[PDB]
């Protein structure tokens, strides 16, 4: 089940690593390569708003 | 859209508990937890008696508790004393932003 | 300590505008909500709008919308009330009470928690 969010930073919803975090990148020597980092522990986030 | 019901007025003996109850609108009362009681000596101004449904603030001993059961909120009052003659009200969160105040129940001692 | 008061009584006829003051003492005032509830002699309590302190922002309940003015004054810790076109019905006293706190992430307006109250206003009109 791949769930398609849209999300810049902070990725949302989805299926966590197995048993440590796990680095993705493609070369880790130029600067212009966006390295992933795969967490194992979820954080919480809530968001709110007002009353239109 | 008109104020929460209330009896007239109600008695009792020394040392014996009384219930003041309120019935509401579902908007009103059956749906926000936002129940306040209100007692006033007469020629002056009115003090807080409960925060929520149920809640004691400081300064105010153990006597009254309240609680709610649908849309009806009650008030028990325990250990009357000549210090009891006073005019309760309810109010409650109506929707909104808007507050609504009931109508006034006077006890009498005995 | 703290205390909320008020202005002395006033006589106004038919037709023209009441001024009621309320002074706030002791403590921040412009992080408390201050609402105002009227009493008619014999009845119980009717609740008019409140005002919030730091925007200046009102709310005004039913059957007053149109004939009151909320405004504040910071510097001089004073919250003022503007009720034109008076009637024989409104002949009541009037409080000024502080509500819940101002919070910037949740909206406690609305909640009915008046600690300190104002000793009252009495207008009569004839
Ligand atoms: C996302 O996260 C954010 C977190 O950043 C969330 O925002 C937070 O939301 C909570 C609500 O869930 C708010 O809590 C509320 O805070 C107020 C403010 O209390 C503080 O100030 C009190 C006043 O004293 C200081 O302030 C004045 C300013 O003029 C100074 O002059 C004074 O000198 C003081 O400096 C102070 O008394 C409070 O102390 C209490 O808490 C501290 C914690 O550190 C304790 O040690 C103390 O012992 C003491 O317990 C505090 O510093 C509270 O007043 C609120 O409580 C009232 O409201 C409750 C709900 O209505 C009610 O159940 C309570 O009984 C209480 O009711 C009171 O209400 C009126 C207040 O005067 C009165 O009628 C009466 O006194 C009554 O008792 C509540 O705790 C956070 O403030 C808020 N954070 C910020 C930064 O605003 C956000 O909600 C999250 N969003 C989500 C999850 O979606
Ligand atoms: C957030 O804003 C919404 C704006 O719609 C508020 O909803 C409105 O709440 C009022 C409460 O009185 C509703 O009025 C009631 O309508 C019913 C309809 O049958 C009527 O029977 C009642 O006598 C009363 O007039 C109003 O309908 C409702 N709006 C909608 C579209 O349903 C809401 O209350 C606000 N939230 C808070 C916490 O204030
Ligand atoms: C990218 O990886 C290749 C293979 O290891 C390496 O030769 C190259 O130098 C790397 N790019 C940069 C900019 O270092």
């Known amino acids: 089940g791949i769930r398609p969010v849209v999300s810049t930073q902070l990725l949302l919803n989805g299926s966590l690593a197995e048993k440590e975090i796990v680095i993705r990148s ?15 522990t979820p954080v919480e986030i809530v968001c709110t708003r007002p009353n239109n | 859209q008109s104020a929460l019901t209330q009896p ?12 003041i109850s309120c019935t509401g609108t579902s908007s009103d009362v059956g749906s926000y937890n936002l129940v306040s009681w209100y007692q006033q000596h007469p ?52 929707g909104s932003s808007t507050v609504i105040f009931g109508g006034g129940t006077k006890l009498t001692v005995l | 300590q703290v205390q909320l008061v008020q202005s002395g009584a006033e006589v106004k006829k038919p037709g023209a505008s009441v001024k009621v003051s309320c002074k706030a003492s002791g403590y921040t005032f412009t992080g408390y909500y201050m609402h105002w509830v009227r009493q008619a002699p014999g009845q119980g309590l009717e609740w008019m709008g409140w005002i919030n302190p730091n925007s ?25 009330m503007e009720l034109s076109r008076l009637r024989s019905d409104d002949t009541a006293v009037y409080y000024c009470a502080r509500g819940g706190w101002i919070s910037l992430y949740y909206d406690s307006s609305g909640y009915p928690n008046f600690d300190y109250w104002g000793q009252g206003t009495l207008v009569t009109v004839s």
């Open chain 2, 8 to 19: 007239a007025s109600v008695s009792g003996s020394p040392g014996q508990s009384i219930t």
């Open chain 3, 56 to 80: 200046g922002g009102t709310n005004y309940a039913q059957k007053f919308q149109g004939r009151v003015t909320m405004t504040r004054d910071t510097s001089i810790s004073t919250a003022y």
């Open chain 2, 43 to 94: 020629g002056k101004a009115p003090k807080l008696m409960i925060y929520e449904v149920s809640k004691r603030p400081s300064g105010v001993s153990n006597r009254f508790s309240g609680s709610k059961s649908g849309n009806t909120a009650s008030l028990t009052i325990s250990g009357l004393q000549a210090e009891d003659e006073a005019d309760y009200y309810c109010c409650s969160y109506a």
């Open chain 1, 26 to 40: 493609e070369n880790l020597t130029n600067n212009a390569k966006i390295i992933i980092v795969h967490l194992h």
